[PDB]
Amino acid sequence: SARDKIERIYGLNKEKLLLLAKVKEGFETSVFDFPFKNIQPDSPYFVCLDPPCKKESAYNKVIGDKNRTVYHEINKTEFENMIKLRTKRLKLLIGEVDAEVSTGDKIEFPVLANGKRRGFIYNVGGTDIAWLNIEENTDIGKDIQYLAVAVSQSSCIQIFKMNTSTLHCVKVQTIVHSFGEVWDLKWHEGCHAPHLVGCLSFVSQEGTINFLEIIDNATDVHVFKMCEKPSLTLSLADSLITTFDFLSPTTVVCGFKNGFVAEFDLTDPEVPSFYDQVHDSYILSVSTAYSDFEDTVVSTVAVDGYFYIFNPKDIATTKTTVSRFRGSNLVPVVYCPQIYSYIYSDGASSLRAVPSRAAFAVHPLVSRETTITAIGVSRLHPMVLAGSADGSLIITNAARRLLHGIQKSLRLWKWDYSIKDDKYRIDSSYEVYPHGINITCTKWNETSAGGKCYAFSNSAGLLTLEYLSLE
């Protein structure tokens, strides 16, 4: 079973292979669900591959001294003729229960049926959430975690404090930017110091990636702040940034509306370390492939249809084509670190993983019927969440023949609009695979505490969160 497929794909190096030994064994059972035990540090199978933007703890080098973000006018009525997000109440149907949620309300699972699942469906101003993001963290937050939610209507960012073991939660801050639609949303994680939250990153439809300090201790449960000046704004005149990933705690990669890719230094912005053309046009996403055993490497897919992996040390000599698609408007890509592979869709309806050191070993994961809209992976486990345009979340285990080398995968949820009623349905219902619905982003909590939590929004504005099991 998989002895020199794994050698072919990953090389020798008795260490890395032992990391892969722990992954194969740990989760080889986990068809659609993994034991919680396997995510705890003390587990003999615990494998946890932090992202590049930890490992240094940045902050003082990047946000430093006087770059700091800005003021806060609540007033709520202020907020309202400023981000008109409501009127209505969306008609819902969970299992067989009719509910009628307006914005800011939620339905909590532990008072639903048997009341055995943990988790909620929340109705963010719906419509829609651009991107969201569970900021991995355990450092004076016993079972408490924060998760950010980007929302558009000029449009803003909501911030949720939440419990890991009950999946209670409150909305703690509503920050109004005028950055328009915001995506590739992710927390730095190298930002800390005391004096509340961590600090948070994203690309905006204004073409700049910017960072902002998220800060406000419980002397006021929920505030309405007006971010008026980000702490950092990576920008390049006459080009527009469309995607970014971290490379280190102090550098980023990004792509541009024009096909160029750049490397930026957060200790020193404006002047990008390189700026070279990589694609023919608009770059839809770029993700970093960090490994403790190879030069870290970057992947990149565009409206041109192509999908390359290269090494920034010298793109010219490393540029490798994984494949070329029929050129979607959306091809989301993430790096799943336990298998060292990128997980991406083509244009249409098939997830694939490709190891970053083996562009030839594309493994198809799932492929069904509808343009895959988003996907989420983890540092802790090899499971992939994946939400289609038909409003459906799919789980699945990487460890295809990816650590198996001789089946595929199930749906956890399925949204549905009415055919006139106004009734949105979710279906808890089990089913295995051999508008104002769909799914806009899905992400794992990635901490040993809430490792089995995930969130997923649909365009309708219904953000739901669950703790994974057997219902």
């Binding site: 160029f260 070279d276 190879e294 030069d295 040390k313 010298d314 000599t317 540029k319 030839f360």
Partner: protein
């Protein structure tokens, strides 16, 4: 004014990386995907100013082998990630007829035409053995690679196993410290001094020279996050580009001077070597200008290209008919100087708004050819048609030429080194300045002559009269003596010549009767060899593409017993035309 642009139809490039080179003998090379594309140098007495008639463009398929083939990817990892081998960069030898290609898998292989010669390899590691850049020795016949250790490995030649070139590892230099794996990403090798760069953008220089000297290297620039765009070297002055900067480094005195660019979009340097004025041309997609390389960098504009380019690019404003109803940019896919450095070739493309991909084969380019000066010369750095190209690109201007040189004036000023062995004696002539000028001018005139050469030949033979005892040699010098209207040795045999299937005998007389043909004993008249002046009895000839003179192919002549003189000629001029020094084509 300007030659008509060359259409390169239905090719594509892997990147915007500079895929154009211009070889000594006049050949264009484009590193296109998946095959190299070649612009074969062609001769036409007349071109209605269409560079179409100077290069015919063709697919140049090659057979890359992976030395790392059966090796599992390691520290790089992106290594054998793409199995199928294709070309990344390509640089023809500045000296020999010969060319090396870095492949996508870090192999640097050397080629004669298409046949691979040797695929450069050495020591061990793998890190040691996979490469990211190579430079040719501009002075003798060697090559350098840069590897993933931050190391330069040098390869020399002969070795042989009978006259087949063949390279081998010769020496190395470490550039980064041991506990590090930044790679060598640039090597420019100029004259007597070599400069290379590493992944961390630190830059080194040395003198590789009297080889017994284990060459001392010196760092000329710290490591930096600023990625080195392009690196070249102008009379002992190193020039870098950046994102938004150009830096200059005087090796001559050790001092750095650098200027912003505004553009911040990386872009390439073209040295203007004939300036006696340390000048360069920075050029980008967007704009471009001159920079004088005094202590202060100075921007003067001219550009002598951009006038032409933006003229062409404004004319294209009909296919977007004036106004921003669309969004246009000029794309450069490569730039390269002439081997002699007198002209410039630019591969470019011009497009619009948001594109509609348009599959692989489907997509064309243009190569623009433009003169960089008002006068030129027959440089030793180009041969054959490469000269002709410059001639054409310079609107039919004759090149400079020394005073009191004339086309019937003696080789080596008449001072013929007849004491030399025959083969050295021919080299001696070929290198001569007069031979070069004559060769080029022969491409200009109606009736190529080689008299000045023939006389040198004759003075050689005559010197050794008692050694012309071979009848082919005889018939040959007799013929020469006739053309030169000069006292021949007497003689009294006939000559018998063959081909695969037939023989014709010739009276030694009848080699004097006529300059163009000889007639046989059986009264069949044949054309003459043109290196040898011997009879042509055989399909198996080579042809000079300019003069159309046909030369005997000795490598296909088992049958006929050529003497020292006559053979030594046919061997020596088996591949190069004496008339114009272009390479002969098998017919």
């Amino acid at each position: 004014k300007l030659l008509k642009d060359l259409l390169v139809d239905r090719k594509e490039f892997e990147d915007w990386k500079n895929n154009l080179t211009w070889a000594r003998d006049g050949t264009l090379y484009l590193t296109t995907f998946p095959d190299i594309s070649i612009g074969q140098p062609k001769y036409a007495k007349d071109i209605n100013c269409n560079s179409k008639n100077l290069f015919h463009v063709k697919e140049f398929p090659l057979e890359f082998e992976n030395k790392l083939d059966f090796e599992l990817a390691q520290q790089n990892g992106l290594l054998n990630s793409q199995p199928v081998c294709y070309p990344r960069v390509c640089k023809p030898s500045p000296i020999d007829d010969w060319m090396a290609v870095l492949s996508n898998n870090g192999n640097v292989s050397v080629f004669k035409d298409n046949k691979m010669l040797t695929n450069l390899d050495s020591k061990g590691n793998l890190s040691s053995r996979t490469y990211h850049c190579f430079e040719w020795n501009p002075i003798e016949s060697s090559i350098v690679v840069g590897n993933e250790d931050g190391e330069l490995q040098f390869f020399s030649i002969r070795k042989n196993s009978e006259n087949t070139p063949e390279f081998y590892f010769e020496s190395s230099i470490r550039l980064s410290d041991a506990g590090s794996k930044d790679w060598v990403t640039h090597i420019v090798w100029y004259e007597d001094v070599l400069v290379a760069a590493l992944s961390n953008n630190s830059v080194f220089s040395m003198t590789v020279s009297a080889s017994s000297h284990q060459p001392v290297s010196r760092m000329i620039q710290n490591a930096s996050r600023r990625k080195i765009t392009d690196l070249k070297i102008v009379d002992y002055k190193v020039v870098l580009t950046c994102p938004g900067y150009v830096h200059k480094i005087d090796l001559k005195n050790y001092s750095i001077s650098s200027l912003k660019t505004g553009s911040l979009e990386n872009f390439h340097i073209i040295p203007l070597n004939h300036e006696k004025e340390s000048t360069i041309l920075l050029m980008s997609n967007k704009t471009s200008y001159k920079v004088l390389l005094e202590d202060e960098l100075h921007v003067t504009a001219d550009n002598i290209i951009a006038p032409y380019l933006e003229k062409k690019f404004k004319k294209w404003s009909t296919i977007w008919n004036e106004f921003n109803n669309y969004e246009t940019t000029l794309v450069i896919h490569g730039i390269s100087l002439s081997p002699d450095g007198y002209s410039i070739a630019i591969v470019y493309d011009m497009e619009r708004v948001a594109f509609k991909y348009k599959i692989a084969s489907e997509q064309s380019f243009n190569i623009m050819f433009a003169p960089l000066y008002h006068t030129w010369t027959i440089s030793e750095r180009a041969v054959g048609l490469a000269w002709y190209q410059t001639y054409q690109i310079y609107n039919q201007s004759l090149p400079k030429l020394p005073e009191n040189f004339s086309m019937n004036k003696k080789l080596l000023n008449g001072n013929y080194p007849i004491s030399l062995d025959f083969q050295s004696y021919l080299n001696a002539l070929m290198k001569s300045e007069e031979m070069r000028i004559i060769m080029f001018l022969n491409m200009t005139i109606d009736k190529p002559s080689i008299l000045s050469f023939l006389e040198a030949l004759y003075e050689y033979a005559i010197n050794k009269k008692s050694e012309l005892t071979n009848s082919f040699d005889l018939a040959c010098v007799l013929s020469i003596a006739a053309i030169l209207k000069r006292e021949a040795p007497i003689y009294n045999g006939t000559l018998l010549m063959k081909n695969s299937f037939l023989e014709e005998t010739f009276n030694l007389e009848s080699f004097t009767a006529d300059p163009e043909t000889v007639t046989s004993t059986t009264n069949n008249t044949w054309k003459r060899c043109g290196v040898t002046l011997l009879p042509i009895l055989t399909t198996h000839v080579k042809i000079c593409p300019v003069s159309k003179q046909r030369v005997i192919d000795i490598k296909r002549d088992d049958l006929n017993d050529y003497g020292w003189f006559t053979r030594g000629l046919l061997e020596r001029f088996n591949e190069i035309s004496v008339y114009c020094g272009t390479t002969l084509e098998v017919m």
